Enzyme design. Structure first.
Site: not given
Length: 170
Positions: A34, A77-78
């Site tokens: 959006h 996880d990153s």
């Protein structure tokens, strides 16, 4: 006399498993861009790379009016590691008397969380869940009773139903 009539019983099981079900469910987090203004990106084409996660499972029908829901979501996880998660339960899908535009269901869902090598024990859990069918997409809310802070928080998740069934000759 027994192995003969009994064989047909097992032969029917091996035949079904060989064909495998016909439903592909994918559990994806509920997101919404959006934004106030559609910001563009300079350089670099295609989509960006960012491991988010996702889940996969199947569905089962019960002649006794039971809808089994099996899904497995995994989180990566990153900068650490990823851990899968299994979940299974039952729910009753109720359809209105007019058209298939709005679906409403309810039931119980179980989840098991396990980590490390294959030796320790997982973490079973049972929480109520609601099924909602809106348009080509499906939404499932998770309820959790208890008196702590709110005691009435409702969650929402996005789900994509995949119906694949091609070919018809072995």
């Amino acid at each position: 006399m027994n192995a003969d009539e009994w064989m047909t019983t097992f032969r029917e099981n091996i035949a079904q498993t060989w064909q495998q079900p016909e439903h592909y469910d994918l559990y994806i987090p509920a997101i919404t861009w959006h934004a106030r203004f559609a910001y563009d990106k300079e350089k670099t084409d295609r989509y960006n790379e960012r491991p988010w996660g996702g889940g996969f499972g199947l569905s089962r029908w019960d002649e006794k009016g039971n809808w089994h829901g099996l899904y497995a979501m995994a989180f990566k996880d990153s900068w650490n590691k990823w851990e899968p998660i299994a979940g299974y339960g039952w729910e009753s899908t109720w359809r209105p008397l007019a058209d298939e535009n709005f679906h409403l269901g309810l039931g119980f869902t179980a989840g098991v969380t396990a980590r490390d090598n294959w030796n320790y024990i997982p973490l079973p859990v049972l929480l109520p869940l609601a099924s909602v069918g809106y348009g080509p997409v499906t939404f499932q809310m998770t309820y959790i009773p208890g008196t702590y802070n709110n005691g009435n928080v409702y969650f929402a998740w996005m789900r994509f139903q995949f119906l694949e069934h091609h070919h018809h000759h072995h």
